[PDB]
Amino acid sequence: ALTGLTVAEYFRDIEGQDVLLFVDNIFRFTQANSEVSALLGRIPSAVGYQPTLATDLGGLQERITTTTKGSITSVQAVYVPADDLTDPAPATTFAHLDATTVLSR
Amino acid sequence: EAAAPAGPKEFTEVWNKKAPSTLIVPEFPSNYTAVKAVGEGQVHGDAFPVNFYTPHSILSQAQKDTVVLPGVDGYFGVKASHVPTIAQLKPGVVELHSGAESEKFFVSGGFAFVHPNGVTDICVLEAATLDQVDPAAVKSALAAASAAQPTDEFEQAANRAAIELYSALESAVEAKA
Amino acid sequence: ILGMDELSEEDKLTVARARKIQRFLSQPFQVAEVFTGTPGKYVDLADTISGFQGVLTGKYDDLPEMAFYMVGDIKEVKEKADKMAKDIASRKEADNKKVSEELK
Amino acid sequence: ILGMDELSEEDKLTVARARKIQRFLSQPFQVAEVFTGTPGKYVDLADTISGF
Amino acid sequence: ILGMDELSEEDKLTVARARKIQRFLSQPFQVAEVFTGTPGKYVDLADTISGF
Amino acid sequence: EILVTGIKVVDLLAPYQRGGKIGLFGGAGVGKTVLIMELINNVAKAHGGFSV
Amino acid sequence: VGLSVSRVGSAAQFPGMKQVAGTLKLELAQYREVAAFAQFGSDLDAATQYVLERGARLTEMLKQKQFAPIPIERQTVAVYAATKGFLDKVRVQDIVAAEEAVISQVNPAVFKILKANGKITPALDAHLKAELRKVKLPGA
Amino acid sequence: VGLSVSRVGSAAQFPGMKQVAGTLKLELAQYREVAAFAQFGSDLDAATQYVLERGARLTEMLKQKQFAPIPIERQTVAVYAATKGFLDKVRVQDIVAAEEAVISQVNPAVFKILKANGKITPALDAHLKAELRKVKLPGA
Amino acid sequence: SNQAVKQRIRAIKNIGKITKAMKMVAASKMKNAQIAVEQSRGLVDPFVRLFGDFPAVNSNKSVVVAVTSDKGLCGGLNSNITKYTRATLATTESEGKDVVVVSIGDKGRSQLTRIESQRYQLAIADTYKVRVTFGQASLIVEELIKHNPQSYQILFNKFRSAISFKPTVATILSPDLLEKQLEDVTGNSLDAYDIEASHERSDVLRDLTEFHLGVTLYNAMLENNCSEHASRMSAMENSTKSAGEMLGKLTLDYNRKRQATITTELIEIIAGASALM
């Protein structure tokens, strides 16, 4: 997703365009960062997550803003792990989400 | 003679004194009816309103110009400004006429009323139409009724009512148009 | 789940007694009067045993729930039941005979 | 639990309005015309606000 | 919740039978005689098959 | 300000903030990939910006 | 308002508010209790309905739109004209117009008095009862 | 069936089975919502009880018998027999006696055509619409 | 200890679906009685426009009939008319009259025995087993007619709609002892009605008031049945909302307990590992 942010940042800042991004299933980016932060020997935080959950998710989500050059609007699919909004992965996700779009069956 | 001034509107104020004040007054059947007795008028020509009733159904409430009641002193017809009447009916046929059309209903025994406003209240238990009765088992029903004659006054009354009901059904099935 | 309608009459008696003794443990404090305006009440031990024995046996079953809310003891319960009843009818009649004419 | 013809006239006009609004929220999409045949229709915002 | 009045006499038959099954799966053991009061039964298999 | 994506429901009811983040609570077979492709096609057609 | 308590600021606040605010607290507490007692409308007592009308009136009075500060002198009057009568003429709806209506249609001289004095003197209480009955209220 | 899903979906389903399984899972999805109402069997609604007894038709249709692997043609034949209504005379607890009273009864002519055909043609559909009528099902 | 809150969720969710089924049952059965109540409303107006409405009469012996339900899922219905029974029986007593309290329905003897037992004689049960029929009404009327009171009072809830159940007193008087006596206004307002009976008026009014009692008791135990279906409908949609909010609170507590258990047993592993290496 940082490679996706880099190609989107080149389309925003240099090409001056109004770029869309699609982070596919941001909970798996949370899970990959949890795996790399449990791998290096850092003490795992709440329910199972990395201790650097909030800052290493905010390192991703805060390059996704408007700029005076252009903008990046990102459409991230969000999956809730136990379908619980008290879980820290959707609780730390939803403090960055602006507009939610429920798809129904 | 009439030393108890009762009434539904007087019952509200005598209910306000003994019951606690937190409850609404209970209702009365006078509040669920609007067609009264001494309300003068309610004729408006030849069509007088007919309230034909039954415990399980309402077969007619529209207005007629002739109703013939099988009263115990004989069948008699009801017109628009009819006499105030409390009539116990024989088991027989009532005749509903609105004009050129005529529909006949066999009644099983029950009262019938006319009030001074020209409205009628026909009040019978089983009001069987003549299209759903049979002319076949009525003679077998009378043959059962003309057979069992014991000495009990209760059975004598029920069996005599059976004879009169079945003979009225025979008279009101043989002479049909 | 069901409500007080489903319960039997002795259980409604138990629930009514229980709500009365559940509100009756409340009192306005003498230190809580700095943010409420209600004057605080010291309750003697004999008055506790009198009021609670009375609501256990049933000497005060006629009184409603709110008569036992924020009260000192069983004298003040019936004193509040006097006040509680009184305002249910006398709620009105302040249109004239006020100081709010212009010239006084 | 009561019946379709049960509700009043003040509400069933809104039942018809919601049942014609909820189908109106759909849209033919231009990327699905390769297997739906109907070409898509890109809708502006002011037209959406006025037509809703 | 309710108490076996609302099963329309089809499921009440299997409720009575299942109560009989739960009571019949008890067995006083030959070692458990000192526990309640009753001597023990070594039940053969065909008795169980034809009984159930 | 608002991003006109072209769909009536996501421009009318839950608008897409231009420069903000969007949550999709999708599933399987509900047409989420068709929604993604139509969003890309509409934004690249109208607003002159690419997608990733 | 049930769980929100602040006991250092009560008996430390603007007293002209604090006259009507205790009555406001009692009416909001009564509305909380009777709204819990009627989660669905089946039983009508015709005096508890006065509570259920007053509380839905006061809830509509207190709520406001975003980024809109209201000074204490334009707040004491708007809660004074709702803890008392002067607003039961609307059902529940046009109080969103009625608050700005009573803010507009009072003399703005009384706002300086209620701000500088600190409390609702009887010399200003009779003016506050006097002005509140000539209001062109848009609710009828 | 309410939890177990295939993320591929019906796109790689056997055709002919795709003609019937979409209606099968639709009636079963209505069944699982009208489930836990079978204990109030005395209270009907005459349409919820029809989908309730059809869910009881289909849920006792799909039972297996412990290493009994069925070819796809006999599967979709039994599913078409249970789905369109050819076993509504059969009671709830004898459908697993009525399945073989379809499969052992109809000829192997229809089965080889359904396997080599790949989808239920309307000629073959009308063939088995009459072929399902001349079998000895446990009805009464 | 985390197994309690999951099985409690299992219990409350199926209780929620039970009441979501029984709201369907009661709101369905309210409609199949609705094709009969307005038909059974046919014979309740002619007698009251004929006999008038005279409840507050000084009867010497009176049979008050408070008809209740069978199954106790009423919801503001049975105890309502139980208090209405004493509330309309207390304003009527002024001189110590004989009172024969009769309750119809199994939920009448369970409640009316507490307040008025010494004047309680008949408890008619299982009356809504199949349906309501008129000969059942004639039989219970005759079982009241074995005694000869001076009046009758019939306490029943008038089903007007699914929200309003105002209880009603239907009045039936004794024919020669009180009915013809109460019509004495400047002579008799009944004598303008010309009699067409076999015998005199004095024994056709007996037949008329027996028919009046039977009809109004039939109407009472039909309207109480339809308002019972309506009140069970209004009570099973409060149990559904209650088992919805209780299920929501228990699901929130299950999520909090799940997170607390996984965090504690993870802390257990980290404290076991970092204190080793």
Describe the structure.
The structure is cut from a larger assembly and holds five copies of chain A, one copy of chain B (177 residues), two copies of chain G (140 residues) and one copy of chain I (277 residues). Chain A is an alpha+beta fold. In chain A, 39% of the residues lie in helices and 14% in strands. Chain A has helices spanning 2-13, 26-39, 53-61, 88-93; strands at 18-21, 71-77, 99-102. The longest helix of chain A is centred in the N-terminal third of the chain and has 14 residues, at 26-39. Chain A is globular, with a radius of gyration of 15 Å. Chain B is of the alpha+beta class. Chain B has two domains: 37-133, no CATH class; 134-173, no CATH class. Chain B has a five-stranded mixed sheet, with no helix packed on it. Chain B is globular and about 65 Å long. Chain G has helices at residues 15-37, 48-62, 73-83, 95-105, 109-117, 122-131. The longest helix of chain G has 23 residues, at 15-37. Chain I is an alpha/beta fold and 277 residues long. Chain I has helices at 4-32, 34-40, 45-51, 78-90, 106-109, 112-115, 134-145, 175-182, 201-274; strands spanning 61-67, 98-99, 101-104, 120-124, 151-159, 165-173, 194-196. In chain I, helix 8 (175-182) crosses helix 9 (201-274). The radius of gyration of chain I is 28 Å and the shape is elongated. At the B-I interface, helix 1, strand 5 and strand 8 of B face helix 2, helix 3, helix 4, strand 6 and strand 7 of I. The PDB classes it as proton transport. The entry lists the keywords mitochondrial ATP synthase dimer flexible coupling cryoEM, proton transport. Cryo-EM structure of Polytomella F-ATP synthase, Rotary substate 1D, focussed refinement of F1 head and rotor.
What would a concise description of this structure say?
This is part of a larger assembly, with five copies of chain A, one copy of chain B (177 residues), two copies of chain G (140 residues) and one copy of chain I (277 residues). Chain A is of the alpha+beta class.
